[PDB]
Ligand SMILES: *C/C=C1/C(=C/c2[nH]c(/C=C3[NH+]=C(/C=C4\NC(=O)C(C=C)=C4C)C(C)=C\3CCC(=O)O)c(CCC(=O)O)c2C)NC(=O)[C@@H]1C
């Protein structure tokens with residue numbers, strides 16, 4: 243059990259469905275980039291170092307980024323000017339270790355946002371009058387399946403020894419069930435659980451991805467590798483990826499359930515084939531999770 | 547008496563929309579609002595017993611029909627009139643062995659973003675009064691009503707304005723107490739199971755229901771769940787004296803009890819679409835949850 247020792251927070255690489263920049267808070271000069279940016283901008287990664295990021299954004303997007311930093315914000319629409327035309331992205335901004343990390347994801351694509359809001363609203367209301375826990379958990383899982391389209395959503399609860407059990411499940415036809423199944427504690431080891439307590443949402447749209455390294459993997463203010471703890475594109479442990487290969491599910495997304503600053507459980511979402519869920523859909527899942535979290539407590543207290 | 551007026555059976559609607567009562571079976575018209583004569587250019591009596599599909603486009607009729615199969619509202623409906631098609635938001639309710647169908651004007655992206663951020667600001671509300679202000683201001687940003695108020699009831703069913711957000715030179719009602727007779731018992735009860743209401747123009751002339759009869763069970767048509775229900779003259783009177791010509795309120799229900807109301811007032815007449823009202827209700831619903839989270843900061 244070297245399981246718990248792998249330093250998952252500093253992998254020096256990202257999942258390539260998105261792009262990452264470290265930029266300075268002053269004039270927003272680039273201090274590191276993911277190597278896959280070469281395909282975006284058609285230039286060697288090294289050559290972007292210390293270049294103002296605004297050179298590759300539209301004026302409106304430059305303005306919008308600058309306002310976001312120097313003054314609720316995520317995601318921010320950013321348009322990148324590339325040699326092969328202007329490309330539109332969801333910009334995901336954060337500050338950690340004296341630096342600013344910008345990540346560029348694909349945008350939200352729904353033709354059905356009003357329906358989306360309605361479903362989230364009726365789910366929150368239902369969750370709030372759930373009379374027992376498996377009912378509350380199942381309302382959560384089924385709404386999450388509604389808005390993600392993933393094949394199988396599970397609510398996984400931790401025992402005192404950090405093993406866990408699937409206590410609720412909603413899945414599409416054909417898909418095998420893991421309901422009531424028990425899993426060993428080493429499947430979600432100690433450093434992962436610590437990270438998931440402070441960073442409650444993660445997605446792996448394609449478990450077969452080729453990691454794209456950071457160039458360079460150095461924090462410009464503090465030295466050392468770039469801490470990707472709070473980054474949405476952080477490359478994930480190869481050992482977990484291999485676990486998922488054996489599971490037969492090639493997209494994964496999970497949301498933490500956190501009670502008393504402690505991991506109570508996870509909403510785990512699997513898909514057979516690779517699949518992306520937009521930032522805004524992930525924020526909706528997190529909302530659902532947070533209401534579920536409150537109701538877990540209401541139910542626990544009602545017994546005692 | 548305030549609490550004795552049967553506000554749920556006025557036998558008339560607000561004329562910014564149209565009401566049809568139809569049968570559960572083959573959707574033949576059992577009653578219409580009198581103003582449907584302006585839409586279809588026939589009298590109500592000529593409409594009675596005609597399948598409502600007769601006045602809908604083929605696709606509109608197909609959607610209406612599947613809605614009554616089995617999360618449905620609003621249904622887009624295009625109606626066939628002498629003067630061409632008109633598109634509508636169809637709001638369908640099913641009760642008392644009849645179907646009520648109401649047509650409203652349809653909607654109209656910055657919009658979708660602004661609901662998302664409102665909710666994200668509520669998710670990180672520091673305290674209960676701040677959460678209420680946020681809901682007030684975000685409701686005001688998306689509705690465009692001149693003044694929004696979070697109004698909380700007391701033990702004795704009287705209440706006060708605990709939060710507010712308003713435009714330049716609209717009067718403030720912050721911290722003002724009002725008596726329980728202002729929202730009387732039969733109202734509070736309705737508003738506990740029917741959470742949103744809008745009056746786009748205080749001074750509307752009601753359009754009567756023709757005929758005002760439930761065809762399966764007898765009696766006045768129960769409009770409890772109707773979005774176009776005509777409201778109490780006594781309340782209209784009061785809004786006229788307040789000097790405000792549009793209102794819209796959303797209920798806050800905690801523990802199967804009315805906890806409070808979000809009240810939105812405009813100086814002039816002002817409709818907003820089913821979709822924005824639904825957005826505001828989402829906001830009310832997130833605020834509701836948060837009231838419990840922030841209250842338990844104790
Ligand atoms: C003897 C009876 C009445 C009386 C009756 C009455 N009121 C209402 C509906 C009300 N009243 C409301 C009151 C307020 N709006 C505010 O902004 C504030 C305070 C800041 C108050 C106290 C509200 C919000 C409603 C709901 C509709 C809306 O949002 O405007 C009704 C029922 C109307 C209906 O048909 O549903 C009735 C019968 N009002 C009196 O003043 C008098 C004592």
Ligand SMILES: *C/C=C1/C(=C/c2[nH]c(/C=C3[NH+]=C(/C=C4\NC(=O)C(C=C)=C4C)C(C)=C\3CCC(=O)O)c(CCC(=O)O)c2C)NC(=O)[C@H]1C
Nearest residue numbers: 245250425428429430434478479481482485494495496510
């Ligand atoms: C010796 C190390 C091992 C190991 C490490 C490992 N696992 C994770 C992350 C996750 N593991 C999860 C397990 C489950 N998913 C399920 O659906 C179920 C049961 C139904 C289980 C038990 C989950 C959910 C995660 C979170 C990611 C996701 O949602 O898929 C990590 C951390 C990965 C990272 O963030 O970098 C690590 C290091 N897993 C093992 O099985 C042993 C070999």
